[PDB]
Design a binder for this molecule. Structure first.
Ligand code: HEM
Ligand code: HEM
Ligand code: HEM
Ligand code: HEM
Lengths: 141, 146, 146, 141
């Protein structure tokens, strides 16, 4: 449940992510509203068209959050506190949506990081995102 | 499933680029590596000990062919999916008792995989068309449970 | 749902001692309290802060009424649930966009509450039947987010 | 997450259970084979019929466990290392099945605690079994 090997691979993947991060985060949002329209439902004060500078600005924020999380992997509950309150209490996102976004992030990490995206690596990111997610929902269960 | 004609095209377009002999196993293997409890169903396969073990097992790559093959029929039948998968649905639900959740999980690793091969070419709109498909396939497979 | 007839009878007969004025609140209230994100839909009802808040919410109360009332209708037309939750599905899948999984939830907490009222009387075989009824209704308000 | 409050009711309610724990762990098992037959596939080496002694035996085993976990409700990750390995690695039980059992355990509790199964307790109990389930499937991480 986030072994080192796991914390090592995450690291690399995100390692090889760099600054494209913001754009990568934006790309996942865009793939998520695309394949998971309903999700659009939480972003009504948003320009959700193809080049949304808003979407651009968020993709950044989200990615930024991941970098952090990646950075405090063994302390996420704490590194991610704030958002847990934002998401559970404030936004009240149906926990489900979390699975959709990780699937989207994954699909974008793979599309860009072909060489790094390997079963084990894929397996380690999945578990990673999986925790980030669990933490962002702790306010529920 | 419904699908737009620049949708229905595009899927099919990309699909034609697929190395069927291969993609089947990258998906199946990855499923088994990423969601280990699915290995239960495939105990007879040989050694699934490791990722490489799994990714390399010939029973895995061969069956990866059969499955991708199911996907091709579905594509040719983006309407009568139900009709198309009726028999498999039986094998799967009645006899194997696989949880329907596992089909969503499979179609989602094959999406990752397609993304994997095609890079920039699997744009978001492309993904979405595929998402549509994969999902229809899933309901289709899980029919016998409803 | 199928349901054998001994099932057909158990669901019923039991359903016959239900103070609807009462169970439909418990159920709609427990949900809001147990699976909290469900609250965003009923922001309008007001204070849902505490369980007692939720529980004492007359709005919560009057609504659960509406729900179970739909249940009895559905409960009456097992044979063709789709006809019944006709407009229902449209509302949830369409105007509201509520994840089907939730429907699933509302159902289980409505089993959980029957178990509370009827104690031993709610039997494993009995639960079994209701469980069937619940899945049906769920699927019936679901198959409109396809 | 197990808020303090949460731990209170778990104890208060479990404590209430007492020695019926066997019964209920058997009632619960039984409830699952019937409402969800799909789960019966993991107990081939058993007689699943009503009277059944084999199930009773296993029901006590479950009850016991719920017990030792309620105890160390504070550190169930260590409190279940064994079962965890067994469920994940040996049995490779699908994680979905946990949610079905917890539900039929909930439905057993409620069946036997009318004065005590309040919408607050309903909730705490619901959280802890999930806690339990997490652990029991953490090795899938
Ligand atoms: C990968 C997991 C996620 C991460 C890291 C994440 C991160 C964030 C961050 C950092 C913010 C606020 C940042 C700021 O304004 O400074 C935010 C806000 C938000 N999140 Fe998430 N999020 C995640 C998952 C989700 C999901 C699955 C949804 C639901 C579709 C969602 C819906 C929202 C919405 C609507 C907002 C705020 C929009 C606004 O500012 O009006 N988030 N998220
Ligand atoms: C979701 C889409 C799926 C498709 C299109 C698919 C396709 C197939 C096909 C074509 C076969 C064998 C037919 C034959 O040999 O004649 C098969 C068998 C099997 N499938 Fe699936 N599969 C899917 C999902 C799954 C999942 C998610 C699991 C397990 C979690 C699974 C477990 C199995 C097993 C264990 C067999 C054994 C076949 C044998 O007896 O050799 N399948 N599937
Ligand atoms: C699954 C069993 C359910 C049944 C039988 C049911 C039934 C109903 C009924 C009869 C109405 C009112 C229609 C009218 O009077 O015009 C309604 C409305 C509504 N339901 Fe449900 N419902 C179910 C599940 C859910 C779930 C899971 C949610 C969200 C968590 C939900 C949220 C809503 C909301 C926000 C409304 C507002 C309609 C209004 O206020 O006019 N329902 N439902
Ligand atoms: C909170 C939920 C659960 C608890 C507390 C639990 C606990 C246990 C315990 C204490 C044992 C016996 C260990 C021993 O003999 O040393 C066991 C075995 C077993 N469990 Fe579970 N378990 C849970 C969930 C499940 C689920 C959801 C399934 C799938 C339906 C499952 C399937 C099995 C099987 C097949 C055995 C083997 C018994 C045998 O070898 O005959 N368990 N479990």
């Amino acid at each position: 449940v986030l072994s080192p090997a796991d914390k090592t691979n995450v690291k690399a993947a995100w390692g090889k992510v760099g600054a494209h991060a913001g754009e990568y985060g934006a790309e996942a949002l865009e793939r998520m509203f695309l394949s998971f329209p309903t999700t659009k439902t939480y972003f009504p004060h948003f320009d959700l068209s193809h080049g949304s500078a808003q979407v651009k600005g968020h993709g950044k924020k989200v990615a930024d959050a991941l970098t952090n999380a990646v950075a405090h992997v063994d302390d996420m509950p704490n590194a991610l506190s704030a958002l847990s309150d934002l998401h559970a209490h404030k936004l009240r996102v149906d926990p489900v949506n979390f699975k959709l976004l990780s699937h989207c992030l994954l699909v974008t990490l793979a599309a860009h990081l072909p060489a790094e995206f390997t079963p084990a690596v894929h397996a380690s990111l999945d578990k990673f995102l999986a925790s980030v997610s669990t933490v962002l929902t702790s306010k529920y269960r | 499933v419904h699908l737009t004609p620049e949708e229905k095209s595009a899927v099919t377009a990309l699909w034609g680029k697929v190395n069927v002999d291969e993609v089947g196993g990258e998906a199946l293997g990855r499923l088994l590596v990423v969601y280990p409890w699915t290995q239960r169903f495939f105990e007879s396969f040989g050694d699934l000990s490791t990722p490489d073990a799994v990714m390399g097992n010939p029973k895995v790559k061969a069956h990866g062919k059969k499955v991708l093959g199911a996907f091709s029929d579905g594509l040719a039948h983006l309407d009568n999916l139900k009709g198309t998968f009726a028999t498999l649905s039986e094998l799967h639900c009645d006899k194997l008792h696989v949880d329907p959740e596992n089909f969503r999980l499979l179609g989602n690793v094959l999406v990752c995989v397609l993304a994997h091969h095609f890079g920039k070419e699997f744009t978001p709109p492309v993904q979405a068309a595929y998402q549509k498909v994969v999902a229809g396939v899933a309901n289709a497979l899980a029919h016998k449970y409803h």
